Amino acid sequence: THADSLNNLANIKREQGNIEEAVRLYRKALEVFPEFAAAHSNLASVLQQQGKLQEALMHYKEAIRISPTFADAYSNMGNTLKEMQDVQGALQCYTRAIQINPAFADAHSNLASIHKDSGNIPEAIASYRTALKLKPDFPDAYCNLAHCLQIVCDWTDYDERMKKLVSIVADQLEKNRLPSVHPHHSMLYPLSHGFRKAIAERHGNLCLDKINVLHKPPYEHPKDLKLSDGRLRVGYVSSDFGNHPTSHLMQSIPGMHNPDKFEVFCYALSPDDGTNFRVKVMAEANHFIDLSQIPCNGKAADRIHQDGIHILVNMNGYTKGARNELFALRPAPIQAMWLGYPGTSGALFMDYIITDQETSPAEVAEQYSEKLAYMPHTFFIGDHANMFPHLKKKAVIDFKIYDNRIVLNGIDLKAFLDSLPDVKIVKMLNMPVIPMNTIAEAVIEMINRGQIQITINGFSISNGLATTQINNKAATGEEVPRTIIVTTRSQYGLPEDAIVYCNFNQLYKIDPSTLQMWANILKRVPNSVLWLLRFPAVGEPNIQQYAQNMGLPQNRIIFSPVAPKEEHVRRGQLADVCLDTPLCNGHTTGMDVLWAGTPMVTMPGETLASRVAASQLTCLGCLELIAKNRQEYEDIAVKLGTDLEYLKKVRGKVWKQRISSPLFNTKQYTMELERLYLQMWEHYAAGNKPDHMI
Amino acid sequence: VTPVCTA
Numbered sequence A: 001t002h003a004d005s006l007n008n009l010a011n012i013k014r015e016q017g018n019i020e021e022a023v024r025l026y027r028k029a030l031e032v033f034p035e036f037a038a039a040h041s042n043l044a045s046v047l048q049q050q051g052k053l054q055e056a057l058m059h060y061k062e063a064i065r066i067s068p069t070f071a072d073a074y075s076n077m078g079n080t081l082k083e084m085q086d087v088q089g090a091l092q093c094y095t096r097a098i099q100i101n102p103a104f105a106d107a108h109s110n111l112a113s114i115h116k117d118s119g120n121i122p123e124a125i126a127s128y129r130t131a132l133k134l135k136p137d138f139p140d141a142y143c144n145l146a147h148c149l150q151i152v153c154d155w156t157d158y159d160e161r162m163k164k165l166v167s168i169v170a171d172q173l174e175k176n177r178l179p180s181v182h183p184h185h186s187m188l189y190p191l192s193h194g195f196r197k198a199i200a201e202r203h204g205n206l207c208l209d210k211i212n213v214l215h216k217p218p219y220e221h222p223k224d225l226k227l228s229d230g231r232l233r234v235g236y237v238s239s240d241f242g243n244h245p246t247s248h249l250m251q252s253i254p255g256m257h258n259p260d261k262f263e264v265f266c267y268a269l270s271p272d273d274g275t276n277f278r279v280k281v282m283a284e285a286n287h288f289i290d291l292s293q294i295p296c297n298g299k300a301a302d303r304i305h306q307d308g309i310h311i312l313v314n315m316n317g318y319t320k321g322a323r324n325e326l327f328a329l330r331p332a333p334i335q336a337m338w339l340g341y342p343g344t345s346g347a348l349f350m351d352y353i354i355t356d357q358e359t360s361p362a363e364v365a366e367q368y369s370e371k372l373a374y375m376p377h378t379f380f381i382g383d384h385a386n387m388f389p390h391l392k393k394k395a396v397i398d399f400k401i402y403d404n405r406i407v408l409n410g411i412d413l414k415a416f417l418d419s420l421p422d423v424k425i426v427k428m429l430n431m432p433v434i435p436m437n438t439i440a441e442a443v444i445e446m447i448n449r450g451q452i453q454i455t456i457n458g459f460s461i462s463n464g465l466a467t468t469q470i471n472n473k474a475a476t477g478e479e480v481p482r483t484i485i486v487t488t489r490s491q492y493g494l495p496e497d498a499i500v501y502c503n504f505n506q507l508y509k510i511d512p513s514t515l516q517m518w519a520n521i522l523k524r525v526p527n528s529v530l531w532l533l534r535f536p537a538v539g540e541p542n543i544q545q546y547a548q549n550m551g552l553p554q555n556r557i558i559f560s561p562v563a564p565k566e567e568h569v570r571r572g573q574l575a576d577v578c579l580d581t582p583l584c585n586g587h588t589t590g591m592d593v594l595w596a597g598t599p600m601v602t603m604p605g606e607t608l609a610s611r612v613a614a615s616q617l618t619c620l621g622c623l624e625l626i627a628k629n630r631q632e633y634e635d636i637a638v639k640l641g642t643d644l645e646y647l648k649k650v651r652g653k654v655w656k657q658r659i660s661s662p663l664f665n666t667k668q669y670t671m672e673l674e675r676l677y678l679q680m681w682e683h684y685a686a687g688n689k690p691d692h693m694i
Numbered sequence B: 001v002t003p004v005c006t007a
């Protein structure tokens, strides 16, 4: 009873976020009563929260030795093992907890979450429904279930589901509980801007609570650039220096920084995955520090302070692998959110968010806890000019003239074309056309028979479906292909004689409203098709069914598998038009379609995430592809699918402007980012505090 | 195999 009062106090101290005081009290409980199963399990749980995973495991096992049927200890032990990447151990614990007590809702929810993470969405949904049957008031299970349903485009009772998510968040905010909607997912649901901001703020708060155990004073920050020989020391912090979308966007940026005025430190939160992405940032940054080797956030943050960083740049936000505890400790006088996270941090510890006028207009500035720091064009950038230079030019084969039926790309394309007798040059600067011919017939035969490659006139000619067999680093975008590649509509079962609208996003970004718009467009344009991905495959029959109920026959939507990075980008050349997802736009995916020369129709919303595509298109200089409402989006899209001369014009415009605009110009981007960094620095060095920048 | 942005 003395023991229980200590334990109960510790429990409350924990819920409040006084982690140190909770630990101290559980240990007191165990001094007074060593065989206290619950106190061991609760201490284990808080040690797990602090990263002390082995010490946690020890206490969970003591709890179970004391009470062999303590299902809750097994459930929480399972979470600890999952955090240590021991999936097998985790499943053994979850299944043991459910065997002890089949009515234990939390264990069902934990099992569901590991099914989800493993790619077993139907089993995750099933386990979440068991949890909700057992305990109907269970916000974590309801919101995680809602995300599973989103992932597979299960829209059963969609509008009441959405109302219920909002309702749960309202209730959770007013009670100062951690909201069950993850900040990253909050963009997909019709929550208020205040709610989205508050969800983010509460998640940042978990990092503040974790760093308080350390007892660190404020760090003292540079007031001038004297220790760094007049150089601004910029620190980029990311878990994604490796094969990840964010590296596919910004891997050239570190090495393009002006070493006369900047000194670049890249802090990796992940170990080296062996990829060229990681090799490049390690080689080209002035300094590369692997913080994955420094688990303790205190020691890791000290390193950033003694490197003397002026601007620390958060590339994760609330994405996997983040360590925002590093930014909670404020080791640098200016802390900015950049590129990797398409939302606000909600946190006081972040000063700016780097964005732009189109993406985040001054009006909607109360979305963000940060001050707006505008790049002059778009804050978005892509490494496509360096990664896929073989797509800078193309040739076609005239089967029956189309730009997107049978396409050739390669670094040595020019020399191959010059080896051929009868090549026609169509001005657009230009598109070589190989006529139907023995050579043209040899190529089409390789494709129709699914062969890997052939040789024509000494040139290597590769089937675009076989890139991982020819050169797996070229397939991933780690190397530029060294062969000429052939890409065709026939490879993907797309019609030779109709308009192909595409969208290559994960299926979770589609909602009922969006698919209704796409169905309207397809009905207005006979024979045309919508080209989607199995992303994941189990989303396919749901999409097809909701489209059938809207009046489209099944043949109007063609699904392809997710491809390796280079194939994905290359095959966008086969589409006529990309239809962007208004709920959450293609971000990296948007840069990808534009690099192929494919116009993208978008309807910007209010969230940062719903406005990225329109910012890209503005920078690109194609204002005619931005819709102000649903009717406009459909008219634009139908116009592009019926007015074939206007299609040819708009495509020609995207094809040229991907080079002549700033969109993919990483040097210009880096230089503009450098100016913006100096503004931020001077503003502060002159005694001022963070303010908006335009 | 295909890396993506995740929560």
Ligand SMILES: *CCCOP(=O)(O)OP(=O)(O)OC[C@H]1O[C@@H](n2ccc(=O)[nH]c2=O)[C@H](O)[C@@H]1O
Pocket (backbone or CB within 6 Å): A244, A245, A246, A248, A340, A504, A505, A506, A533, A561, A562, A563, A564, A565, A566, A568, A585, A586, A587, A588, A589, A590, A592, B002, B003, B004, B005, B006
């Ligand atoms: C923070 C991610 C910003 O990009 P977004 O458009 O949201 O893309 P994600 O869904 O997070 O990631 C998609 C990732 O997958 C590549 N991809 C897509 C499709 C395909 O067939 N093959 C791919 O390799 C995209 O290029 C992107 O990097």
Ligand SMILES: [K+]
Pocket (backbone or CB within 6 Å): none
């Ligand atoms: K079952």
